[PDB]
Design a protein around this ligand. Sequence first.
Ligand SMILES: *[C@@H]1[C@H](O)[C@@H](O)[C@H](O)[C@@H](C(=O)O)[C@H]1O
Length: 458
Amino acid sequence: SPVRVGLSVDASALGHTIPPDYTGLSYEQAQMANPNYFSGANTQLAGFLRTLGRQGVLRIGGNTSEYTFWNRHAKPTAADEHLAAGPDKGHHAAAREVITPEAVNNLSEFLDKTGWKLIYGLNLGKGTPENAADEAAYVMETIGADRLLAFQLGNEPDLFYRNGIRPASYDFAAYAGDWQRFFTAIRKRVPNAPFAGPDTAYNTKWLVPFADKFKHDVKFISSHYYAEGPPTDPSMTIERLMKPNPRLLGETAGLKQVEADTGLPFRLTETNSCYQGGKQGVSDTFAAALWAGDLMYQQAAAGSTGINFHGGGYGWYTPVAGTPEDGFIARPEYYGMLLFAQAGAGQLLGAKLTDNSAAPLLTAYALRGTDGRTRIALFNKNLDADVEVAISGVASPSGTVLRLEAPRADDTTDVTFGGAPVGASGSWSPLVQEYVPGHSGQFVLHMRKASGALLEFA
Ligand SMILES: *[C@@H]1[C@H](O)[C@@H](O)[C@H](O)[C@@H](C(=O)O)[C@H]1O
C-alpha cells in the first residue's frame, strides 16, 4: 500500500552544476600529530576517500585546531604514532598536540594518493601569527598551490569564549584584528596563500561582516551546519533528522545573499547530524545515510560549492571509522555519500513531486550527468510510508536502480548500496541489477520506507 506520488523531470529547468570536488570530509587538526594517519602508507583510508570521489576536499581544522601547534623543530613522539583523534566533544580544552614536518610531508603523499584538495586550519585561537606563517609556508612548500585550496584562521571564532580561548567580550571587531594580523604575517612568508573563512555557522554578527570586510582576501566563505540545534532543543531523533530544517534553509539563503553581495562562493566545511561527535542511535545509523545524501543534494541545488562531513576516530557520526593499526570501515553515513559519488557530477534539473502530502519526506533530485545520462537520486526519508513514484519527463529505453537500504532506520550495520556493503579500503561495486519498469514514456519506481535510490537512464 505505497503512497502513489508523481515525479516530473524537466530538462529545461536548469539548476546548479555540481562541481567535481563537491564531496569532502572534515577532520580534527589534532589528527595531524600522527604522521601515519594522513599518509601515503594509509592505503585503506585513501581508498575510502577515492570511493567518495575522484575529486573532493579534505578539510583539517575543528576545535582541536586551537590546541594544535606546528613545530618545525619537532619529530613525532611514540604516543603520536598511535593517536586517533575523533571529533572534539566540546566538553573542555582538547590536549595540546604538535604537528611536525614529517606529518605535513606525509599529508602531501596522502593528497597525491587520493587526488583530493586540502583546506588546512591554522592556530589563531592560541598560536602566534609568526608560527602560523611558518606552518603555512611549510604546507605551501610541501603540498603546493594546486592541492592547497585554502588556509583557515581559526575554527568557529564566535565560540572561542565557550572554553576560554577568548574572553566573553570577543566579537567580530576583535576577531577581524586577529585575522588581519595573521593574514599579514602569513602573506609575508607565502605571498600566494589562499584563505577561506570564517569557518562557522552562518550568523549576522560574524559571517556577514567577515565577508564584507575580507572579500578581497579570501577565496570563498566557509560555513558550518549541524542538524541538531542548541542543547535546549528536544534531543535530536531520527524522526526529526528526516524532516526539513528551517534553520538550514535560512542560513543557506543567508550564504546566497553573501555571495550576491561579495562575489564569494560558499562551502560547508564542517557538517554532521549531531554535536559532540554525534548522538548514538541517531548519528551512527542508516538514517544518517539518508540525511547526509539528501543534504549533499539539497545544498548543491542551493548553489553550495561543496561539503565536508566531520568525522574521524570512531566518532558516532564519522563517515569512515578506524585506525591505521586496526583498519578502517565505512559507517552508515558513508553510504549516503557513496550514492552521491556514484551519481557523479552534472547539472541539476527540475524534479517536482506531486500527490506527495502523505509521503512528505521523500526528496528527489534529477541530474544531467557530465556523461550526458539522466540520473535521479531519491531519498524516501518517510519512516513509515513506502512510495510508488510515477516518473515523467525522461525519455530512455532503459533505467536501472541502485538501492540504498537497511532493514531498519536506526540500524548501525546491515547497510548496503546496490546490493553490496562497502568492503576494505573503500572497495565497492554493485551486486544487484534492477531495471525500473517503463511504459507510456514513464517509469514506475517502488521504494520502501526509509530507503534511497539512484536511477540511471540510458
Ligand atoms: C565542529 C567543531 O569544530 C568540531 O571540533 C566538533 O567535533 C563538532 C562537533 O561538535 O561534533 C563541531 O562542533
